[PDB]
Amino acid sequence: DAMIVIDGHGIIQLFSTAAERLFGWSELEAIGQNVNILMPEPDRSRHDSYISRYRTTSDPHIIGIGRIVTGKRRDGTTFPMHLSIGEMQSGGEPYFTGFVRDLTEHQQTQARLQEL
Ligand code: HEM
């Protein structure tokens, strides 16, 4: 599915090709950008703090755990997605891998069955 790998500062290091389709951002555009360019406010501005809370407390809030959140596409549109984070380490520094599963279709179907 879509996969994003960030370092300990929230900077994107690898943006798979499906992520490009899903978010709109190309690989070269994504890499180097902080992951918070993928979420609306208030989380955008506080996403770094969330990561900082975890790097100092060593207390996992959403690691392993799979969570449903709102992603933001390049054209400004938000959408729900399921995200699962796996923590890793390379060259001494920590890295984080996110596996996104688009849920837009599941949210639309649900709204539709609601509406009928
Ligand atoms: C793109 C939509 C995203 C949103 C809305 C989002 C939102 C959040 C929120 C609200 C928190 C804190 C949750 C809590 O402490 O209970 C958090 C933590 C974090 N997020 Fe995200 N996130 C997004 C994507 C990502 C991605 C793609 C990565 C992939 C590496 C990632 C990695 C992290 C990490 C490492 C933390 C800290 C985890 C922790 O405190 O346990 N996030 N995120």
Side-chain angles (χ1 to χ4, degrees), residues 1-100 102-116:
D1 302 7
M3 92 133 201
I4 304 144
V5 172
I6 70 180
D7 63 10
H9 293 330
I11 299 288
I12 294 161
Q13 300 298 293
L14 292 167
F15 203 62
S16 69
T17 128
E20 301 185 333
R21 298 178 204 135
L22 180 52
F23 292 101
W25 297 107
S26 80
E27 178 160 65
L28 271 170
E29 288 170 349
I31 296 178
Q33 290 317 295
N34 192 136
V35 68
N36 69 32
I37 64 161
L38 302 177
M39 62 198 73
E41 295 286 8
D43 292 328
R44 173 179 293 240
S45 302
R46 37 175 64 136
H47 194 273
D48 276 2
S49 80
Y50 295 155
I51 289 178
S52 211
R53 192 208 68 33
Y54 178 57
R55 294 201 69 202
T56 60
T57 64
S58 313
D59 197 345
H61 264 210
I62 302 189
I63 299 285
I65 303 194
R67 297 286 243 153
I68 308 196
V69 307
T70 316
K72 184 172 187 180
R73 303 179 201 266
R74 187 183 201 173
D75 58 40
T77 62
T78 58
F79 68 109
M81 48 179 241
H82 175 271
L83 167 63
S84 225
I85 296 303
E87 186 175 351
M88 283 152 2
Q89 294 258 328
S90 177
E93 66 192 350
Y95 285 75
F96 296 95
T97 310
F99 292 98
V100 184
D102 192 17
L103 268 19
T104 314
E105 202 176 14
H106 302 240
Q107 178 186 64
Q108 290 179 7
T109 292
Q110 187 161 119
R112 192 62 174 178
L113 293 182
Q114 173 105 63
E115 178 182 0
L116 305 181

